[PDB]
Design a protein around this nucleic acid. Structure first.
Ligand code: MG
Ligand code: MG
Ligand code: MG
Ligand code: MG
Ligand code: MG
Ligand code: MG
Ligand code: MG
Ligand code: MG
Ligand code: MG
Ligand code: MG
Ligand code: MG
Ligand code: MG
Ligand code: MG
Ligand code: MG
Ligand code: MG
Ligand code: MG
Ligand code: MG
Lengths: 141, 55, 206, 59, 56, 143, 70, 145, 63, 67
RNA sequence: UAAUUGCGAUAACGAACGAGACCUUAACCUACUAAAUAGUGGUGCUAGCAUUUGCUGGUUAUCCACUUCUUAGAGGGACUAUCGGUUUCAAGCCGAUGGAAGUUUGAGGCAAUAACAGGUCUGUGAUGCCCUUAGACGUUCUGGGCCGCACGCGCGCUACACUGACGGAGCCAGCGAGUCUAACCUUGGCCGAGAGGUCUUGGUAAUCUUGUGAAACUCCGUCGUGCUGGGGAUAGAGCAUUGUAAUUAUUGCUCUUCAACGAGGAAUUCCUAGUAAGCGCAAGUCAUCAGCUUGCGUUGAUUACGUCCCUGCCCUUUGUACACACC
């Protein structure tokens, strides 16, 4: 066996599972390299963890992620979270603490909920309107 | 369902619901204990269904 | 910048820029200082961003809305007029195009030009309707900084979305135009005229 | 049906809309809702016999 | 036999509903308070809870 | 270094494999092509005229390259899109079960796809070979 | 129908001599100079890119952009 | 594609099938100013006549035009599916037709008269200028006649 | 054109019958030790900076 | 708006009344007290109760408190 | 304070119903118990590209191990905590840090006393009285009718386009539901332009439909501001499906026809965060029919975080000759 950690990240419904094992540094999303990922204007959102912490952090580790569920955007925010959570979970159990508390510190600074799963979520709609807050319409008489 | 029996009022909807929980447990045993275990452990309200084999 | 390659390759200018400087699509957050007093704290620029999209929670409190990066404040107000309600991917690309357009003309980090057009269209004072008995005079009021950034954001995008309506020019061409004229205000822009007209009515009652 | 004149669009199109088409709720008796029309009333004996009265409470 | 689990328990409740009705009319003068139905091997047991058993 | 088709971006792979299937001439392009509309929920036939059967053959290929097994029905639902019902709200509608089945058959006759067990159509062992090939050939244009 | 659907040999050379000093050239900008509807306007963008002049610093459908040659 | 040049060769506004058609529009939507020829029907005909849709109605060698006319009024000979056609199984002779130009007005008269002469309720409805297809006429359809 | 910058010192309250207007005292940062109470339009917290377009005038109540 | 009910402020009364030589200004330990010392019917009422007896405790250390 | 929620003032003290508590649902558990009807890694068997090991797949049991992801049992967790401002330094409020979470955590369920001639005898084999009871107001059967169109009102759907239509192409959810004494949900193979047809197939279901490959949306082209290829009413002609029955056209497809509408007067509805709006989906109804409804997720803002000006109602004080209570 080789050192490895599994992590995940979630935005709305989307859950992005991650596997961080010691390796030659591939970064792959479901089947494919992190340089595709498109929507593609959002691409730098999933780049963000690699760049904030520097690209050299990935040379001793292999990175794969599979995103079930969510939608064409929520999937992009779910993966980037599992990538950062995975990089920090590795220095948790494998390299030392001070390296990990240096990584969290430089994700948390900039951030966008990179280690922390956002709490927002659809509210139930209720009878009398098509929306959650929305009511329908009334003319009185 | 609409709460009203008939027509009138701001239209109030009230959703009833019933929850069904289903478990299954796999055992390997003899003929005797299967019958000893199925006849007893009788409970009203819980539906026990014991199938057999591998296919 | 001391390059690197692990297995799956990371492209060259992508590898390069990020590690060194953390910048825009590609654009400078360094330099680009707010050109008017106040209007800082109420225009962001540092912390820098790659592209304007965020899961940001800017709603839950009164003034955390101001802390939103300013460019995304400009994109956010693009996507609306309910056919376009939602569609931030739509707007973000229009902005990237828009910035690239402004960049073409007169150099100037266009993010800074955006900082300039916002500073230059915010009404310094305005009027409201006082009751004072029925027929209502106008008590002129100086308007808050937050409402000077907000109104500028609304005034700029609306004037371009209204002008770009029914003609060949794309939103990003008029958005950039409307900003270019309002970066140093020429009074040829929809936004500037409304700023100067509100400040005229506030001066005309007092 | 086809032969008969005084039929079809163009004929109705040239007539005039009655003003009963534009009228309103008409409502016919609301402010009398509380006022019982029966003219019966009841009595204090017949209610106290059915529902019992506060003077016999002890027993 | 062969009826789905969802449709089973539903019909099981409707069966209880029709059962409790038929007794509440039939045992009225007997103080009928309710039932429960235990299902077993060999048997389906129905207990009539009334306040007067010597009449039932 | 080694190559998959997953290592190439979505469109440049389907543009390449279209030009290749076009360069080839070994196709089976049924011939109601140019006259048909591709879906009930569509309006005009494709603007590719001569073409677009290679585009959909390429598209169908890569899709079956990805996964275990897919059929004609799956490709209808996949390839279909929102139908404008006129003055009534939009509804998703499946595309034609002919174009796709004829694309599967043609690509089977040309040996990029086979009739998989359990159901449907599987990527051919020869399809892996040739698709991974042209994938690299497009990655190699960027060299 | 208002002129910009065609070639008109004097027009071709106009595009040749009229596109320095344009910091901006695109679909709209080509029509803006009183010519070239957005069909053949787009064709001039790929053709002025055959050699010289326009620099492709912008990508895709709808929005186009190019600056002067250096 | 290609910047083209030409000279004086193309004419704007060329007349065919008893209607007038502007040049300087892209030929597929140009033919649609004839009656009976839809966007689909124009598209199939040009694909059949060996013409480039890239061209406008402007250039279009004179030979290509007569060919284009030919296929239009003879769809079933030129291998056009006949479910593509606005009159299938006719009414009298049963042949599949595509009724073209000022003729589609005629057949609208023809059929409308057929129901009327037969006294069928559908014609009765056309006589009164109502909606035939069976929609409620209470609310909708007011300005109209 | 004499720009006059003034820093909100405190938040006095909401005037106007509507109530969008706020009452605030402001110390101008160019020559402090002098104060004016102003009426704002948009929302305001402590230590903001208003632009007084004309330096000397002030109101109190709004109906 | 968070305003504790009377049952919460009433129970904190009797608790600081007789159990002061116990508890503390740490919520967490007071919470565990209200299990071993008191019978409440839910986890939420108890954290609510104990959370407020912690507050009443926290201010008794500076100045008396009526009740 | 959301609250007769509390602090405080106090001839009142101390309580009960109702609010709260409680319950349900969505957020957090690398801690607990597990899972071939959920899923991961190793391994065989194996395909493709590369080869230096690599990369990308196939394979309901060929085996081993795991429970992060999924499922739901038991627990845990938040009490507006810490600190600081503000205040009768009171209940509280506000800010910052931390936190899954700090607007009653979000959203619902439940909800006292009382009142209304509110609605419902057209849900009931709940019912009083009245009416009718065989040339029936019982009941069934044939056909029509609720749809009938000079026109007034209201809920809505689709647009007036270029933040767009169209054509390729990328390709991503959640709430659901499905056939026994029966014909429900439908994969796949063919045939058909399509609608559909047809031969088989799994599923009484986390097992099969179904990863519901949904739609908006993203990408590359075509059109280029012209009532234009925006828009799809009206109408003709043909092909199919449900049904004993489709004419007054149940629904679906193909062709053609190509209207009004160039942002809407006076007015007026709805809404503060994953909300509004844009977007579809499933369920209800259902033989066939959604432009409706009940829920669902997708994309995802602008602007308040205030007041009593408008409108509405609640509370005090006050008047009363009302109390069947200003009808
Ligand atoms: Mg799709
Ligand atoms: Mg598509
Ligand atoms: Mg036509
Ligand atoms: Mg007290
Ligand atoms: Mg209570
Ligand atoms: Mg778990
Ligand atoms: Mg925080
Ligand atoms: Mg009444
Ligand atoms: Mg009766
Ligand atoms: Mg009716
Ligand atoms: Mg499209
Ligand atoms: Mg038109
Ligand atoms: Mg159209
Ligand atoms: Mg059904
Ligand atoms: Mg339905
Ligand atoms: Mg209904
Ligand atoms: Mg009195």
């Amino acid at each position: 066996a080789v050192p490895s950690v599994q992590t995940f990240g979630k935005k709305k419904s989307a859950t992005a599972v991650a596997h961080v094992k010691a390796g030659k540094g591939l970064i792959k999303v479901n089947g494919s390299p992190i340089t595709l990922v498109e929507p593609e204007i959002l691409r730098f959102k999933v780049y963000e963890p690699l760049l904030l912490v520097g690209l050299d952090k990935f040379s001793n580790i292999d990175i794969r992620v599979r995103v079930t569920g969510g939608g064409h955007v929520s999937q992009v925010y779910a993966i980037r979270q599992a990538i950062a959570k995975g990089l920090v979970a590795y220095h948790q159990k494998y390299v030392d603490e001070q390296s990990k508390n240096e990584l969290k510190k430089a994700f948390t600074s900039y951030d966008r909920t990179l280690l922390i799963a956002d709490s927002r979520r659809p509210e139930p709609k209720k009878f009398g309107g098509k929306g959650a807050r929305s009511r329908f319409q009334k003319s009185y008489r | 369902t609409r709460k009203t029996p008939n027509g009138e009022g701001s239209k109030t909807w009230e959703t009833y619901e019933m929850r069904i929980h289903k478990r299954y447990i796999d055992l390997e045993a003899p003929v005797q204990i299967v019958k000893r275990i199925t006849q007893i452990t009788i409970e009203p309200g819980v539906d026990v269904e014991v199938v057999v084999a591998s296919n | 910048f001391t390059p690197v390659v692990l297995a799956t390759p990371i492209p060259e200018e992508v590898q390069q820029a990020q590690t060194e400087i953390k910048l825009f699509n590609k654009w400078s957050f360094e330099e680009v200082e707010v050109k008017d007093a106040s209007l800082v704290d109420y225009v962001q620029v540092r912390q820098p961003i790659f592209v304007a999209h965020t899961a940001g929670r800017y709603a839950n409190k009164r003034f955390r809305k101001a802390q939103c990066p300013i460019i995304e404040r400009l994109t956010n107000s693009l996507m609306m007029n309910g056919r376009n309600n939602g569609k931030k991917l739509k707007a973000v690309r229009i902005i990237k195009h828009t910035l690239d357009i402004i960049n073409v003309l007169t150099d100037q980090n266009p993010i800074q030009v955006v900082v300039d057009a916002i500073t230059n269209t915010g009404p310094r004072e305005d009027t409201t309707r006082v009751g004072g008995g029925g027929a209502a005079r106008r008590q002129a009021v100086d308007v808050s900084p937050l409402r000077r950034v907000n109104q500028a954001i609304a005034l700029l995008t609306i004037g371009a979305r209204e002008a770009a309506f029914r003609n060949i020019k794309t939103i990003a061409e008029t958005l950039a135009e409307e900003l270019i004229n309002a970066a140093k205000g020429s009074s040829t822009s929809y936004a500037i005229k409304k700023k100067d007209e509100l400040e005229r009515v506030a001066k005309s009652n007092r | 049906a086809i032969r008969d004149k005084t039929a079809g669009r163009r004929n109705n199109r040239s007539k005039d809309v009655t003003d009963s088409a534009t009228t309103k709720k008409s409502n016919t008796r609301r402010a009398t809702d509380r006022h019982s029309r029966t003219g019966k009333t009841d009595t204090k004996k017949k209610v106290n016999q059915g529902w019992g009265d506060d003077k016999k409470e002890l027993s | 036999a062969l009826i789905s689990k969802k449709r089973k328990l539903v019909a099981d409740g409707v069966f209880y509903a029709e059962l409790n009705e038929f007794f509440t009319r039939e045992l009225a003068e007997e103080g009928y308070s309710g039932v429960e139905v235990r299902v077993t091997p060999t048997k389906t047991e129905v207990i009539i809870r009334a306040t007067r058993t010597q009449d039932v | 270094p080694g190559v998959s088709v997953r290592d190439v971006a979505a469109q440049d792979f389907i543009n390449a494999y279209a030009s290749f299937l076009q360069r080839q001439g070994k196709l089976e392009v049924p011939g109601y092509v140019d006259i048909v509309k591709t879906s009930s929920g569509n309006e005009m036939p494709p603007q590719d005229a001569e073409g677009w059967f290679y585009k959909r053959a390429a598209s169908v290929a890569r899709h079956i390259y990805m996964r275990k097994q897919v059929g004609v029905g799956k490709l209808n639902k996949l390839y279909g899109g929102a139908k404008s019902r006129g003055v009534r709200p939009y509804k998703h509608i499946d595309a034609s079960g002919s174009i796709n089945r004829k694309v599967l058959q043609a690509l089977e006759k040309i040996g990029i796809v086979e009739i998989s067990p359990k159901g449907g159509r599987r990527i051919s062992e020869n399809g892996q070979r040739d698709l991974d090939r042209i994938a690299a050939q497009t990655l190699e244009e960027d060299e | 129908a208002q002129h910009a659907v065609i070639l008109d040999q004097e027009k071709y050379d106009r595009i040749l001599k009229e596109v320095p000093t344009y910091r901006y050239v695109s679909v709209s900008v080509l029509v803006d100079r009183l010519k070239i509807g957005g069909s053949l306007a787009r064709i001039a963008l790929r053709h002025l890119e055959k050699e010289g002049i326009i620099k492709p610093i912008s990508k895709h459908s709808k929005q186009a952009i190019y600056t002067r040659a250096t | 594609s290609l910047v083209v040049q030409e000279q004086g060769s193309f004419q704007h506004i060329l007349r065919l099938l008893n209607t007038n058609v502007d040049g300087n529009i892209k030929i597929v939507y140009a033919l649609t100013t004839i009656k009976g020829v839809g966007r689909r029907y124009s598209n199939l005909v040009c694909k059949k006549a060996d013409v480039d849709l890239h061209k406008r109605a402007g250039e279009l060698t004179q030979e290509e035009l007569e060919r284009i006319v030919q296929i239009m009024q003879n769809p079933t000979h030129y291998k056009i599916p006949a479910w593509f056609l606005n009159r299938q199984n006719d009414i009298t002779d049963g042949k599949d037709y595509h009724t073209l130009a000022n003729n589609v007005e005629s057949k609208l008269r023809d059929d409308l008269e057929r129901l009327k002469k037969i006294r069928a309720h559908r014609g009765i409805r056309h006589f009164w200028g109502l909606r035939v297809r069976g929609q409620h006429t209470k609310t909708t359809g007011r300005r109209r006649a | 054109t004499p720009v006059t910058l003034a820093k909100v010192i405190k938040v006095l309250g909401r005037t106007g019958s509507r109530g969008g207007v706020t009452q605030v005292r402001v110390e101008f940062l160019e020559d402090t030790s002098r104060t004016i109470v102003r009426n704002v339009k948009g929302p305001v917290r402590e230590n903001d900076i208003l632009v007084l377009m004309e330096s000397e005038r002030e109101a109190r109540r709004l109906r | 708006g968070r305003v504790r009910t009377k049952t919460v402020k009433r129970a904190s009364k009797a608790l600081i009344e007789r159990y002061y030589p116990k508890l503390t200004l740490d919520f967490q330990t007071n919470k565990r007290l209200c299990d071993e010392i008191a019978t409440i019917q839910s986890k939420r009422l108890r954290n609510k109760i104990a959370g407020y007896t912690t507050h009443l405790m926290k201010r008794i250390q500076k100045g008396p408190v009526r009740g």
